[PDB]
Amino acid sequence: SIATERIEKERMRRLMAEDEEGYRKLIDQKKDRRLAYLLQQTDEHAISERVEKQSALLINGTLKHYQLQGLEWMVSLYNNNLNGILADEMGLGKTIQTIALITYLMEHKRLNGPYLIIVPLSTLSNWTYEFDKWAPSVVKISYKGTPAMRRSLVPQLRSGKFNVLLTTYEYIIKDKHILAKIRWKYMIVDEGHRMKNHHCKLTQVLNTHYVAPRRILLTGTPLQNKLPELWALLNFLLPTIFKSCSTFEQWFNAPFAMTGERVDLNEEETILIIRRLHKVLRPFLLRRLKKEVESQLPEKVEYVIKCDMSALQKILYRHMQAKGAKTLMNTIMQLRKICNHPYMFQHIEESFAEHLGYSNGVINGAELYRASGKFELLDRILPKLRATNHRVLLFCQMTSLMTIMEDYFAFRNFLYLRLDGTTKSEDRAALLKKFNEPGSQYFIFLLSTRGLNLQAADTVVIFDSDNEVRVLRLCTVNSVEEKILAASSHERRAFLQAILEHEEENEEEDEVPDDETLNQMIARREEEFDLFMRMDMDRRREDARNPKRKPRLMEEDELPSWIIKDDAEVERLTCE
Ligand SMILES: Nc1ncnc2c1ncn2[C@@H]1O[C@H](COP(=O)(O)OP(=O)(O)O)[C@@H](O)[C@H]1O
Ligand SMILES: N#Cc1cc(C(=O)Nc2cc(F)c(=O)n(CC(F)F)c2)sc1C(F)(F)F
């Protein structure tokens, strides 16, 4: 192999010198051999099963007829030993159909797994919520977090006491020495809306190191017309055709490695490769549009949206954590206030205004939303919802927070009504009538979670918890808010300490969604998504022009030297 490479190298170097026309005749012969081969390998009855019901293990909702065919389709794939792409439009039950598959195979094929599901990090909590709702019997692992955390889980893996494991791209790559070893019965991956640049590296590693018989690719976009992408799709769906862990550019150039001379396809040659790969992949792709199944669309569409913390949120959080019975119950109240807004702490707001350039000591404008992950995220939801004439219902369990909520709506000029436990039955009735009468210009209905029929509201933003209706629960990243979503006086104290088991993290991937994932959860149609994408770039235009540009979240570099390493000061400003 060195001996041959040394010689075959000198062979190519000697033709370049002594018969340049013969050297050209060879390379053009080699180029065509790669094409002819590519075409030749791709130039190529089935087992029936009818699926009348869903799994008995699938509960708390019954499948739509179209989703039933999705299940029946992916089962047909299974029996006939095939891979697939479920590419249904956004909001049609791709996550619910994947759970219907696993639960059906566990029941009727006694296939207990293990099932590997790879998802974008921002939607992990979304996946884990919808498994808890629809298939709680299923035993699942969440392989992510600090090494300490990941190692904690190795016993349960070697053991094999689990049906499903969810993880993200970095852990599939970082921890191959743990995860590749497992003998996965299934390898389901979530691309999100569209293929991203980092998915080429993922395709290669997967069929370099991992051993999964069955594969599914979940996606929101239809079959693309670019060679490099479609190569990764061929080698994920049908790896046995070319048994290669390469990019198309490397695979095609393989024979010219010793030439030291790259080879590039022309217009005619490209279109043909693309037109073929299209024809090879087409039969393996099921895509139903919202309009095709209009009379079966889900009535309630739920999603979980994620928040970073401001630099301020972090420092306050770390303080109230490492300072910590109904004392615990109290420590969980303070951590919820921070995730909600740091300026709930009056003395923190006043001192920061002095430093942000407000003599008066009352924060206003953008600086309201900039100090809270959740408020900053809400600022990217509500404008969009309003621009599509959607009428929101926003739950806020804390009556303290509502002062800051009202001041935020004031800033963005959102017309609203408020309803608390400080509202009499006479006042209540009238407020509801005002929101519900046809034409009401009242956009938001701010509520304190204490019976009330707001049929006028077609959107529900849960802000802090314990005729299609879109529900959006906000949730802070690596916070208590994650732990509350996951749902004997010695054991009821050990439960409140399981709520408090925090660990500081430094993952690679963003735990907050990009603009495409987010507008997919807010939007009910292709027009809403399209608009929201423009509204997002309109915000990037506004910021670009603005002379005094600040990031959307307050970062450490713009903090005062009196909050940075001063457990006294934080305590001096937070206490009551
Ligand atoms: N057959 C159904 N019955 C009840 N709710 C459903 C059904 N199908 C989907 N939903 C709801 O609609 C939403 C669909 O989420 P999902 O389809 O998994 O995400 P996406 O379609 O964006 O991949 C969820 O809130 C789910 O509970
Ligand atoms: N994540 C990840 C990931 C995404 C992959 C991919 O093939 N995306 C492509 C490539 C297309 F060409 C295309 O048309 N589409 C749309 C089609 F589904 F109709 C998708 S492969 C992969 C893996 F293996 F890394 F997990």
XYZ file of C-alpha atoms and ligand atoms in Angstrom:
629
model
C 0.000 0.000 0.000
C 3.022 2.371 0.642
C 5.013 0.396 -2.016
C 2.070 0.676 -4.526
C 1.260 4.374 -3.634
C 5.009 5.296 -4.025
C 5.071 3.617 -7.529
C 1.559 4.687 -8.790
C 2.511 8.281 -7.653
C 5.794 8.172 -9.720
C 3.725 6.599 -12.613
C 1.392 9.689 -12.646
C 4.386 12.102 -12.217
C 6.154 10.437 -15.247
C 3.144 10.603 -17.693
C 2.833 14.379 -16.862
C 6.489 14.669 -18.090
C 6.724 12.225 -21.049
C 3.194 11.908 -22.675
C 0.930 14.818 -21.499
C -1.776 13.842 -24.091
C -1.754 10.211 -22.767
C -1.937 11.557 -19.147
C -5.125 13.573 -20.088
C -6.676 10.485 -21.856
C -6.236 8.493 -18.564
C -7.802 11.076 -16.141
C -10.888 11.542 -18.425
C -11.153 7.672 -18.585
C -10.988 7.476 -14.702
C -13.544 10.361 -14.263
C -16.097 8.497 -16.494
C -15.432 5.141 -14.652
C -16.548 6.842 -11.348
C -19.771 8.203 -13.014
C -20.576 4.892 -14.870
C -20.013 3.018 -11.521
C -22.145 5.584 -9.552
C -24.980 5.034 -12.134
C -24.517 1.188 -12.332
C -24.841 0.534 -8.511
C -28.052 2.703 -8.360
C -29.712 1.261 -11.576
C -31.926 -1.158 -9.485
C -43.873 -7.889 -4.030
C -43.675 -6.799 -0.318
C -44.980 -7.993 3.141
C -48.537 -6.766 4.068
C -49.696 -5.680 7.570
C -52.907 -3.633 8.285
C -52.895 -1.426 11.480
C -56.574 -0.926 12.606
C -55.734 0.512 16.132
C -52.692 2.260 17.700
C -50.693 0.559 20.546
C -52.466 -0.002 23.938
C -49.249 1.651 25.320
C -50.231 4.860 23.360
C -52.694 6.836 25.584
C -54.058 10.370 26.404
C -55.145 11.032 22.769
C -56.152 8.841 19.751
C -54.329 9.087 16.347
C -55.775 10.790 13.218
C -56.451 8.504 10.175
C -53.495 10.125 8.263
C -51.111 9.553 11.268
C -52.422 5.913 11.347
C -51.167 5.474 7.712
C -47.808 6.969 8.855
C -47.577 4.201 11.526
C -48.730 1.513 9.005
C -46.124 2.930 6.519
C -43.109 2.788 8.966
C -44.243 -0.782 10.024
C -44.323 -1.834 6.299
C -40.744 -0.388 6.153
C -39.838 -2.594 9.204
C -41.346 -5.900 7.898
C -39.715 -5.317 4.437
C -36.356 -4.414 6.054
C -36.272 -0.799 4.634
C -35.417 2.791 5.799
C -37.688 5.871 5.337
C -38.128 9.688 5.562
C -41.257 11.040 7.378
C -41.387 14.622 5.923
C -44.932 15.736 7.009
C -45.421 19.586 7.140
C -44.851 21.368 10.542
C -47.403 20.597 13.335
C -48.781 17.314 11.819
C -47.509 14.842 14.508
C -44.009 13.683 13.361
C -43.003 13.277 17.099
C -46.417 11.591 17.917
C -46.078 9.200 14.885
C -42.472 8.218 15.946
C -43.877 7.345 19.464
C -46.802 5.406 17.829
C -44.121 3.346 15.928
C -41.991 2.494 19.029
C -45.130 1.641 21.145
C -46.607 -0.500 18.272
C -43.317 -2.464 17.777
C -42.879 -2.955 21.595
C -46.469 -4.393 21.813
C -47.021 -6.449 18.594
C -43.359 -7.411 17.763
C -42.144 -7.541 21.452
C -39.265 -5.211 20.301
C -38.197 -3.626 23.671
C -35.233 -1.910 21.898
C -32.873 -0.263 22.391
C -34.241 2.679 20.254
C -31.806 5.610 19.528
C -33.537 8.999 18.783
C -31.134 11.878 17.770
C -32.783 15.386 18.023
C -31.698 19.059 17.954
C -30.867 20.048 21.609
C -33.541 22.866 21.663
C -36.412 20.316 21.163
C -35.080 17.582 23.575
C -37.403 18.845 26.417
C -40.215 18.936 23.762
C -39.604 15.217 22.861
C -39.306 14.169 26.574
C -42.619 16.037 27.366
C -44.554 14.298 24.500
C -43.220 10.805 25.555
C -44.363 11.542 29.196
C -47.845 12.594 27.850
C -48.444 9.835 25.182
C -46.264 6.817 26.290
C -45.247 7.142 29.988
C -44.793 3.290 30.322
C -41.779 3.645 27.878
C -38.457 3.828 29.899
C -36.211 6.592 28.365
C -32.669 8.011 29.076
C -31.612 11.654 28.329
C -27.895 11.231 27.399
C -26.511 14.806 27.790
C -25.004 17.084 30.499
C -21.619 17.214 32.329
C -19.268 14.181 32.087
C -20.169 13.494 35.789
C -23.853 13.253 34.643
C -23.109 11.095 31.519
C -20.937 8.603 33.551
C -23.803 8.335 36.150
C -25.911 6.725 33.325
C -23.321 4.102 32.098
C -24.626 1.518 34.657
C -28.199 1.721 33.191
C -26.756 1.362 29.609
C -24.556 -1.778 30.242
C -27.627 -3.026 32.257
C -30.008 -2.445 29.265
C -32.915 -1.414 31.624
C -34.318 1.161 29.094
C -36.465 1.185 25.880
C -35.370 4.602 24.413
C -32.310 6.959 24.585
C -32.446 10.615 23.308
C -29.135 12.507 22.663
C -27.641 15.295 20.436
C -24.907 15.442 17.713
C -21.958 16.361 20.028
C -22.511 13.290 22.355
C -22.818 10.863 19.337
C -19.297 12.205 18.355
C -17.712 12.944 21.843
C -18.883 9.659 23.523
C -18.695 7.082 20.640
C -16.573 4.958 23.103
C -19.858 4.555 25.142
C -22.822 4.980 22.714
C -21.522 3.231 19.487
C -20.966 0.009 21.599
C -24.760 -0.413 22.202
C -26.557 -2.667 19.639
C -29.436 -0.279 18.600
C -32.566 -1.923 17.028
C -33.495 1.571 15.599
C -31.704 4.868 14.645
C -34.333 7.679 14.307
C -32.810 11.200 13.713
C -34.521 14.672 13.721
C -33.007 17.089 11.120
C -35.426 19.805 12.380
C -36.937 21.976 9.567
C -34.033 21.742 7.038
C -30.592 20.034 6.719
C -27.882 22.133 8.508
C -24.133 22.321 7.634
C -23.078 20.237 10.741
C -25.207 17.192 9.590
C -22.530 15.987 7.009
C -20.013 15.226 9.858
C -22.915 13.470 11.725
C -23.851 11.232 8.710
C -20.165 10.074 8.359
C -19.578 9.284 12.119
C -22.983 7.426 12.294
C -22.196 4.870 9.510
C -18.434 4.880 10.461
C -18.990 3.723 14.130
C -22.716 2.934 14.971
C -24.669 -0.318 14.150
C -28.441 0.366 13.630
C -30.518 -1.978 11.393
C -33.599 0.329 10.978
C -33.282 4.109 10.272
C -35.807 7.015 10.062
C -34.996 10.659 9.090
C -37.599 13.157 10.495
C -37.764 16.441 8.452
C -40.156 19.349 7.604
C -38.767 20.140 4.070
C -39.288 18.253 0.757
C -36.570 16.499 -1.354
C -33.735 19.040 -2.097
C -31.881 19.452 -5.486
C -28.216 19.848 -4.299
C -25.629 17.032 -4.826
C -23.688 17.270 -1.489
C -26.862 17.106 0.701
C -28.481 14.269 -1.399
C -25.200 12.231 -1.046
C -25.550 12.298 2.802
C -29.270 11.358 2.385
C -28.346 8.351 0.118
C -25.585 7.125 2.549
C -27.993 7.525 5.580
C -31.050 5.805 3.920
C -29.151 3.237 1.701
C -25.582 2.960 3.121
C -25.140 -0.589 1.594
C -25.098 0.863 -2.000
C -21.651 2.610 -1.625
C -20.535 1.434 1.918
C -18.739 4.880 2.155
C -18.330 7.360 5.106
C -17.201 10.256 2.832
C -18.431 13.595 1.364
C -19.353 13.368 -2.395
C -16.248 15.535 -3.204
C -13.932 12.956 -1.450
C -15.795 9.850 -2.839
C -15.618 11.064 -6.516
C -11.910 12.158 -6.168
C -10.874 8.820 -4.451
C -9.233 7.374 -7.636
C -7.145 10.595 -8.250
C -5.636 10.703 -4.678
C -2.148 9.745 -6.060
C -2.510 12.134 -9.097
C -2.591 15.031 -6.542
C -5.061 16.600 -9.068
C -8.721 17.268 -7.974
C -11.645 16.558 -10.414
C -14.787 18.823 -10.602
C -18.145 17.887 -12.296
C -19.575 20.248 -15.018
C -23.237 21.419 -15.532
C -24.449 18.404 -17.657
C -22.709 15.730 -15.422
C -24.077 17.297 -12.127
C -27.829 17.619 -13.114
C -27.773 13.875 -14.097
C -26.367 12.724 -10.662
C -28.991 14.990 -8.926
C -31.884 13.867 -11.247
C -30.997 10.168 -10.417
C -30.478 10.426 -6.579
C -33.909 12.218 -6.618
C -35.454 9.133 -8.408
C -33.685 6.654 -5.995
C -34.850 8.445 -2.774
C -38.384 9.489 -4.011
C -40.217 6.196 -3.186
C -38.913 6.187 0.462
C -40.373 9.677 1.307
C -43.901 10.205 2.783
C -44.985 13.917 2.970
C -48.589 14.970 3.794
C -49.451 18.737 3.649
C -51.779 20.510 6.192
C -54.255 21.216 3.302
C -54.467 17.481 2.236
C -55.703 16.439 5.788
C -57.358 19.798 6.772
C -60.402 18.019 8.410
C -58.078 15.941 10.735
C -55.567 18.626 11.957
C -54.941 18.483 15.746
C -57.129 21.019 17.680
C -54.529 21.579 20.501
C -50.853 21.973 19.295
C -48.373 22.191 22.255
C -44.591 23.028 22.238
C -41.894 23.872 24.897
C -39.669 26.939 24.057
C -36.301 27.476 25.841
C -34.520 30.528 27.389
C -30.857 31.277 28.156
C -30.248 33.413 31.302
C -28.924 37.010 31.295
C -25.423 37.330 32.863
C -27.362 38.906 35.829
C -29.817 35.929 36.046
C -26.752 33.568 36.268
C -24.996 35.391 39.215
C -28.295 35.738 41.230
C -29.138 32.024 40.506
C -25.653 30.741 41.598
C -26.068 32.836 44.843
C -29.576 31.559 45.868
C -28.470 27.967 44.885
C -25.246 27.727 47.019
C -27.045 29.559 49.927
C -29.593 26.672 50.279
C -38.654 21.717 55.338
C -40.577 24.742 53.873
C -37.126 26.482 53.676
C -36.487 24.431 50.452
C -40.036 25.317 49.210
C -38.833 28.981 49.691
C -35.451 28.492 47.833
C -37.542 27.193 44.826
C -39.648 30.456 44.996
C -36.502 32.709 44.749
C -34.993 30.623 41.842
C -38.384 30.949 39.965
C -38.314 34.796 40.440
C -34.769 34.989 38.889
C -35.755 32.874 35.785
C -38.886 35.153 35.620
C -37.027 38.545 36.003
C -34.003 39.814 38.038
C -35.723 43.284 38.417
C -38.420 41.571 40.594
C -35.672 42.285 43.222
C -36.331 46.068 43.561
C -32.814 46.963 44.924
C -31.101 45.088 41.975
C -33.198 47.099 39.410
C -32.429 50.502 41.085
C -28.585 50.006 41.262
C -28.391 48.675 37.617
C -30.395 51.696 36.267
C -27.705 53.992 37.896
C -25.023 52.096 35.834
C -27.146 51.667 32.601
C -27.494 55.529 32.454
C -30.893 56.139 34.245
C -30.545 58.815 37.034
C -34.298 58.340 37.858
C -33.644 54.626 38.763
C -36.583 53.241 36.646
C -35.475 50.844 33.803
C -37.387 51.262 30.465
C -37.252 50.420 26.709
C -35.427 47.215 25.602
C -33.452 46.968 28.929
C -36.718 45.477 30.400
C -36.512 42.309 28.188
C -32.624 42.296 27.958
C -32.238 41.264 31.673
C -34.464 38.105 31.354
C -34.106 35.167 28.906
C -37.915 34.572 29.146
C -38.944 38.243 28.499
C -36.414 38.492 25.571
C -37.898 35.247 24.037
C -41.539 36.462 24.616
C -40.506 39.657 22.671
C -39.880 37.289 19.641
C -43.320 35.512 20.071
C -45.952 38.258 20.750
C -45.186 40.738 17.881
C -45.414 37.735 15.450
C -48.723 36.496 17.004
C -50.159 40.101 16.830
C -49.105 40.597 13.133
C -51.288 37.474 12.310
C -54.301 38.873 14.331
C -53.983 35.977 16.896
C -55.409 36.684 20.409
C -53.164 35.362 23.252
C -53.992 34.142 26.818
C -50.844 34.581 29.014
C -50.762 32.759 32.447
C -48.589 34.392 35.196
C -48.915 32.530 38.580
C -46.805 35.259 40.379
C -48.887 38.456 41.038
C -45.554 40.297 41.845
C -44.361 39.779 38.195
C -47.532 41.391 36.671
C -46.193 44.960 37.439
C -43.159 44.173 35.124
C -45.392 42.319 32.576
C -47.769 45.387 32.342
C -44.688 47.726 31.997
C -43.431 45.448 29.112
C -46.844 45.496 27.271
C -46.833 49.329 27.813
C -43.396 49.465 26.010
C -44.593 47.327 22.984
C -48.086 49.005 23.089
C -50.082 45.713 23.420
C -53.756 46.318 24.458
C -54.600 43.914 27.357
C -56.873 43.021 30.316
C -55.641 41.706 33.758
C -57.444 39.162 36.078
C -56.171 38.307 39.645
C -57.460 36.849 42.947
C -57.945 40.597 43.876
C -60.888 40.754 41.338
C -64.585 40.487 42.524
C -67.191 38.304 40.630
C -68.872 41.546 39.312
C -65.552 42.895 37.815
C -64.568 39.346 36.565
C -67.766 38.799 34.440
C -67.324 42.254 32.728
C -63.567 41.677 31.919
C -64.413 38.301 30.204
C -67.341 39.919 28.244
C -64.959 42.687 26.985
C -62.331 40.186 25.621
C -65.012 37.845 24.128
C -67.306 40.344 22.285
C -66.551 40.141 18.506
C -64.106 42.930 17.443
C -62.477 43.369 20.922
C -59.085 45.126 20.280
C -57.774 43.490 23.554
C -54.826 41.370 22.180
C -53.455 39.767 25.446
C -55.489 38.439 28.465
C -53.052 38.468 31.470
C -54.308 35.904 34.091
C -53.335 34.665 37.637
C -53.714 30.824 37.693
C -56.659 30.587 40.200
C -63.509 28.180 35.383
C -63.017 30.985 32.765
C -64.156 30.507 29.084
C -61.929 32.589 26.686
C -62.962 30.895 23.353
C -61.867 34.228 21.680
C -58.232 33.285 22.651
C -56.641 30.936 20.023
C -53.083 31.074 21.567
C -52.003 30.249 25.194
C -48.517 31.358 26.484
C -47.846 29.652 29.889
C -45.251 32.002 31.543
C -44.820 30.139 34.922
C -46.869 27.007 35.933
C -46.757 23.994 38.357
C -60.656 27.307 16.195
C -57.202 25.578 16.607
C -55.546 26.394 20.031
C -51.706 26.905 19.963
C -50.092 26.396 23.470
C -46.498 27.614 24.173
C -44.912 26.822 27.597
C -41.721 28.931 28.131
C -38.957 27.202 30.204
C -35.465 28.427 31.318
C -32.348 26.319 30.363
C -30.514 24.358 33.137
C -33.028 25.798 35.686
C -35.584 24.515 38.275
C -38.309 25.257 35.612
C -37.060 22.151 33.665
C -37.440 19.999 36.862
C -41.055 21.153 37.641
C -42.087 20.197 34.025
C -40.810 16.607 34.782
C -44.061 15.285 36.443
C -44.138 10.129 53.595
C -42.593 13.390 55.025
C -38.959 12.087 54.663
C -39.732 11.271 50.957
C -41.602 14.589 50.160
C -38.409 16.469 51.323
C -36.213 14.173 49.100
C -38.599 15.097 46.177
C -38.075 18.901 46.729
C -34.244 18.278 46.801
C -34.533 16.353 43.435
C -36.148 19.635 42.154
C -32.996 21.524 43.414
C -30.269 19.138 41.985
C -28.587 21.861 39.797
C -25.173 21.445 38.006
C -23.356 24.233 36.012
C -22.834 23.127 32.342
C -20.820 24.107 29.205
C -22.332 22.109 26.266
C -21.281 22.789 22.608
C -24.732 23.099 20.890
C -27.182 26.020 21.580
C -29.951 24.856 24.016
C -32.136 27.793 22.691
C -33.816 27.332 19.257
C -32.684 29.164 16.048
C -35.253 31.413 14.194
C -36.411 28.499 11.892
C -37.225 26.034 14.780
C -38.999 28.863 16.741
C -41.219 30.255 13.896
C -42.181 26.587 13.102
C -43.735 26.362 16.670
C -45.505 29.840 16.554
C -46.822 29.596 12.902
C -50.042 27.681 11.856
C -49.404 27.941 8.020
C -46.580 28.461 5.412
C -47.615 32.204 5.159
C -47.245 32.743 8.986
C -43.753 31.049 8.961
C -42.622 33.073 5.855
C -43.848 36.361 7.459
C -42.203 35.507 10.853
C -38.864 34.776 9.066
C -39.039 38.278 7.414
C -40.045 39.852 10.805
C -36.929 38.118 12.298
C -34.637 39.585 9.565
C -36.472 42.985 9.912
C -35.225 42.845 13.580
C -31.632 42.110 12.305
C -31.954 45.134 9.885
C -33.214 47.437 12.757
C -30.234 46.281 14.955
C -27.693 46.654 12.043
C -28.624 50.365 11.405
C -28.935 51.278 15.154
C -25.799 53.241 16.247
C -25.664 51.905 19.897
C -26.052 48.112 19.143
C -26.307 45.844 22.256
C -26.913 42.053 22.208
C -30.533 40.910 22.972
C -29.326 39.447 26.368
C -27.118 41.383 28.890
C -23.631 39.702 28.731
C -20.855 39.606 31.429
C -18.623 42.227 29.643
C -21.316 44.951 30.359
C -21.564 44.380 34.192
C -20.361 46.592 37.098
C -17.385 45.472 39.309
C -19.689 45.472 42.445
C -21.908 42.462 41.398
C -19.158 40.196 39.902
C -17.590 38.455 43.000
C -19.494 40.037 45.965
C -21.796 37.488 47.765
C -22.383 40.345 50.305
C -23.725 42.866 47.693
C -26.010 40.236 45.967
C -27.374 39.409 49.490
C -27.553 43.203 50.363
C -29.835 43.756 47.277
C -31.877 40.433 47.195
C -32.975 40.145 50.912
C -36.315 41.345 52.480
N -53.610 12.638 16.981
C -53.371 13.625 17.842
N -54.188 13.765 18.913
C -53.938 14.758 19.777
N -52.966 15.669 19.759
C -52.173 15.506 18.687
C -52.306 14.538 17.710
N -51.310 14.679 16.755
C -50.610 15.708 17.164
N -51.083 16.260 18.328
C -50.519 17.389 19.056
O -50.019 18.328 18.133
C -48.633 18.630 18.417
C -47.799 17.958 17.363
O -46.418 17.892 17.778
P -45.492 17.055 16.773
O -46.273 16.734 15.546
O -44.840 15.933 17.509
O -44.416 18.127 16.283
P -44.087 18.404 14.728
O -45.327 18.068 13.917
O -43.725 19.877 14.662
O -42.923 17.487 14.398
C -48.408 18.158 19.854
O -48.748 19.166 20.795
C -49.367 16.970 19.964
O -49.832 16.759 21.281
N -29.118 15.172 11.367
C -29.124 14.804 10.295
C -29.095 14.289 8.967
C -29.778 14.876 7.913
C -29.587 14.230 6.747
C -30.185 14.543 5.454
O -30.161 13.660 4.620
N -30.794 15.712 5.170
C -31.382 15.874 3.896
C -30.627 15.789 2.707
C -31.259 15.940 1.512
F -30.555 15.851 0.383
C -32.644 16.178 1.453
O -33.204 16.303 0.374
N -33.342 16.264 2.604
C -34.787 16.478 2.566
C -35.368 15.071 2.383
F -35.645 14.485 3.623
F -36.470 15.065 1.531
C -32.724 16.107 3.811
S -28.550 12.836 6.979
C -28.384 13.171 8.639
C -27.568 12.342 9.604
F -27.248 11.097 9.030
F -26.415 13.060 9.933
F -28.317 12.125 10.771
